[PDB]
Design a protein around this nucleic acid. Structure first.
Ligand SMILES: [Cl-]
Ligand SMILES: [Cl-]
Ligand SMILES: [K+]
Ligand SMILES: [K+]
Ligand SMILES: [Mn+2]
Ligand SMILES: [Mn+2]
Ligand SMILES: [Mn+2]
Ligand SMILES: [Mn+2]
Ligand SMILES: [Mn+2]
Ligand SMILES: [Mn+2]
Ligand SMILES: [Mn+2]
Ligand SMILES: [Mn+2]
Ligand SMILES: [Mn+2]
Ligand SMILES: [Mn+2]
Ligand SMILES: [Mn+2]
Ligand SMILES: [Mn+2]
Ligand SMILES: [Mn+2]
Ligand SMILES: [Mn+2]
Ligand SMILES: [Mn+2]
Ligand SMILES: [Mn+2]
Ligand SMILES: [Mn+2]
Ligand SMILES: [Mn+2]
Ligand SMILES: [Mn+2]
Ligand SMILES: [Mn+2]
Ligand SMILES: [Mn+2]
Ligand SMILES: [Mn+2]
Ligand SMILES: [Mn+2]
Lengths: 97, 87, 96, 110, 98, 80, 110, 97
DNA sequence: CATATATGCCGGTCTCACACGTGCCTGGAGACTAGTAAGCGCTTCTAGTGGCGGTTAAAACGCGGTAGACAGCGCGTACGTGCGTTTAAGCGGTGCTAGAGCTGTCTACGACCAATTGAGCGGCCTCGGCACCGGGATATATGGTAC
DNA sequence: CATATATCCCGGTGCCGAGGCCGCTCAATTGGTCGTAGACAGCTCTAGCACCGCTTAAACGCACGTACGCGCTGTCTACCGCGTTTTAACCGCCACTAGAAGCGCTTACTAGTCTCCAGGCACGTGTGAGACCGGCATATATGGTAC
């Protein structure tokens, strides 16, 4: 029986996804959420598939950006684990409130 | 004259795995269990702001279809400019 | 001498100050912040309006563009009211 | 004969001046008749909304004349004006009083 | 003799300076620094008195802001003391630093 | 000796206090002088660049304002 | 004659097109003859400056064709382009490989 | 039929691409990102030029405005090289016509 | 509890900025004309939507255990206070004059025009770059083991 | 040291997207016209600068010591890695039509032009809001000591 030590696969994954550019959220779930949120602003809206892709590109870009800043705040607190309070300080200092 | 499936709790399609993958590209190694709801919260606020603006552009153009340009102008407005979709 | 002439919104801030606070005044500095404020928001709404026109291949900035602009520019409540006072004054102006 | 469009629209804010500034400002080839009316209306509203709260902030301070602080206090204590002027600095405005709770002394008698 | 416990005057000063809106850097030391930095871009330069005020208003504002965010970063690390590393994290997250 | 030191320990303290800072590290003061300088540099560089273009030898408040605007630090009450 | 004003300036970028987009662009009542030439030159420069670094990245990745990742690598690794495009998202760019030190496993005699 | 006429900088990007990297090509998406780049920087310069004119009560955007724009808007060594490349093309144009 | 001190406040005193009345002047507002932007009909057909089933990669769950979060400790000194000492900022001042910036003359240059033509576009056709795959060479983390 | 398990790197294979030929056609180039923006130079006198010498207030440096940062330790469980089972994304195809995108007709809208008429300005005033402030009142931090 073989077993990696906690964090060995995490590093592996960091390298894997920082090499790649493929979108990391599944396409259909994201779309349903775009339709769901758009429907609540206006009924009977259609989307050019590019407008969804553009929206997904912008969303993942934003979230990867935010996990970086989060991670720095985690590390600033002599920790290695990101926590809601990390996200919250990142967003506060960004001015997103 | 055709029933559209009523859309409900789709923010949960932003799964734990997907959020973790996003944190990985961000060079995050370890993740609290409370991060995935916190994240969904933030994603949802982000998407609502861009789509509010996007749809405003559409409504002004008297269109019923949201265009990639509408999203691009929305994003530019919010200071999150995006190359590779026109404009 | 030479005189020289430089405009402002100073009068219109005072006329509005007397409507809402009839027995209250305002320092020249504070008048400058109100003047900066008006020109800023003007630039913002005009600008957004300018782009709205351009994005749709239209050569005119109509009250429509000024509205869509205000809706993008002002937060939830402030926008609601703005769109009221705006539509109202447009309606009042065309009837006279 | 001759009466200001400002009055026709029921505004203190100069509809005519605004129409000029829209044309002079290279925003589009042409400017509609409603555009300067609508815009002037919004500008006057926001002016009122700020002055309303700024006037208040003066009374609370026991002063008849609005100073920059009253405009700051007004803008930073209203959620929606503070978002609109998030990226703006008000000269001689100062900041809202706000010590972080962790910085306050022990006091554990409640 | 009499002595205020360390922390107490500091809180009074926070209360004091948050109350006021007066500029907190002395004007002439500032005015000399503005001229000093300006010389390195264009020589034989003259300043409207108002332009030096504007720069000083915008500088104090910016720094007072940054100390707010620096203070939050210090508190985040369970401290009460702001340290260079706090200013650096604030500036990094703001987008100013890399 | 330099003009930057004219931005004194106590001045920086006052600024921090208005910021709500209770306790200040000894190293802060130099760090802040570094930050302040980069701020003035970036702002003044643009202000002068505006002066240059107006073919003036006097930096106006309108230069600084347009400069502060460019950098996204819009200032009210100096001619915005 | 009919010789491209592009050629008169010794540029690949279309000086005439840029002259149109400046006039049609709600920018100013009048546009000089220099403006579009100067502008098209700066656009051509910056285009070349990034296409150099993006081509180099493509060749390092054993590829004939520049793809967005190549532009992302080109732009983020260059100090001055990264600052110019600091507030820009390149669709399908990804991120620069960067793992903070404190996350890397200890006891490595490499 | 025969879809409407859409302009693009993609003809001049390929030209400069062949100048700089003669054996290197470019993908649809890459060319798209290059188009967004040229449109973006155009607008940034054209705007700061428009403001310089206005701030100085001038009815005309000249090469002198483009220049100052480029000084304000490009960082250090990129501005220096851009200005020179700019000034040159003007000078070369001034004498030709 | 009492004592020390910082701050808040009163009521009076003064001063200078505000807020008013008074020209004066230019920048608009009533006509008025004349051409274009855009509104609104009609048509084409693109691409957005919704549905189905085969395949399987990703998601979900539960398990087990490790390494990181957290809290409590204790040591050392970097701070905050407060004092007596030094320094220079601020000020009111009296010049001194660069230059901001206003006015008035005169090209040079840029818009507008509206026939002439090749630069640049949408199709269309087609290979060669590269996506995808599996075989083999390392590279590293983990764990077996001998010392 | 030994071995298990990812990842890298290789040619081989097949698809389809980049890129190059074509032919049609707009928007850009010509070249002549005309209106005025702005270049240039003179003049004015605003307001920026600079040497002076008081008078404080603010900076400085110093020395005490306390609360806080910081490194250590030990506890404990939350979070990681992995095997199994569950699920729904993806793919490739249908079939269906909304509405996007484009064209031609047509006219209220607005811009451009004069003339006029008061709205907004720079000026000049005098006076009341508020800055200052002495000394007095109130709130609160701080330590003593007896429980
Ligand atoms: Cl209108
Ligand atoms: Cl020019
Ligand atoms: K469609
Ligand atoms: K002067
Ligand atoms: Mn709903
Ligand atoms: Mn009692
Ligand atoms: Mn008592
Ligand atoms: Mn009183
Ligand atoms: Mn009076
Ligand atoms: Mn039309
Ligand atoms: Mn199915
Ligand atoms: Mn367990
Ligand atoms: Mn515990
Ligand atoms: Mn041609
Ligand atoms: Mn051809
Ligand atoms: Mn090949
Ligand atoms: Mn393989
Ligand atoms: Mn081991
Ligand atoms: Mn051994
Ligand atoms: Mn190969
Ligand atoms: Mn002139
Ligand atoms: Mn000591
Ligand atoms: Mn220690
Ligand atoms: Mn239809
Ligand atoms: Mn006046
Ligand atoms: Mn006093
Ligand atoms: Mn006590």
């Amino acid at each position: 029986p073989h077993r990696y030590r906690p964090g060995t696969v995490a590093l592996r994954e960091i390298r894997r996804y920082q090499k790649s550019t493929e979108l990391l959220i599944r396409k259909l779930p994201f779309q349903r959420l775009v339709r769901e949120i758009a429907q609540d602003f206006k009924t009977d809206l259609r989307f050019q598939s590019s407008a969804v892709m553009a929206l997904q590109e912008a969303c993942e870009a934003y979230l990867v950006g935010l996990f970086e800043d989060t991670n720095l705040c985690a590390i600033h607190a002599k920790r290695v684990t990101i926590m809601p309070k990390d996200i919250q300080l990142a967003r506060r200092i960004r001015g997103e409130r | 004259k055709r029933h559209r499936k009523v859309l409900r709790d789709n923010i949960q399609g932003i799964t734990k795995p997907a959020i973790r993958r996003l944190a990985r590209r961000g060079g995050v190694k370890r993740i609290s269990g409370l991060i995935y709801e916190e994240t969904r919260g933030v994603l949802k606020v982000f998407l609502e702001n861009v789509i509010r603006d996007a749809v405003t552009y559409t409504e002004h153009a008297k269109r019923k279809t949201v265009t990639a340009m509408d999203v691009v102008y929305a994003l530019k407005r919010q200071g999150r400019t995006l190359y590779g979709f026109g404009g | 001498r030479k005189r020289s002439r430089k405009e402002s919104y100073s009068i219109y801030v005072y006329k509005v100050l007397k409507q809402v606070h009839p027995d209250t005044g305002i320092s020249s500095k504070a008048m400058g912040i109100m003047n900066s404020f008006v020109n800023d928001i003007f630039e913002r709404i005009a600008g957004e309006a300018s782009r709205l026109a351009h994005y749709n291949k239209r050569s005119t900035i109509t009250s429509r563009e000024i509205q869509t602009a205000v809706r993008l520019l002002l937060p939830g409540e402030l926008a609601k009211h703005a769109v009221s006072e705006g539509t109202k004054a447009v309606t009042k102006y065309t009837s006279a | 004969k001759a009466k200001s469009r400002s009055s026709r629209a029921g505004l203190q804010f100069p509809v005519g001046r605004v129409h000029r500034l829209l044309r002079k400002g290279h925003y589009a080839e042409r400017v509609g008749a409603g555009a300067p009316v609508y815009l002037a209306a919004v500008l006057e509203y926001l002016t009122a909304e700020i002055l309303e709260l700024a006037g208040n902030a003066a009374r609370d301070n026991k002063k008849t004349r609005i100073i920059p602080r009253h405009l700051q206090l007004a803008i930073r204590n209203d959620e929606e004006l503070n978002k609109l002027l998030g990226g703006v600095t008000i000269a001689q405005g100062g900041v809202l009083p706000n010590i972080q709770a962790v910085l306050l002394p022990k006091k554990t008698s409640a």
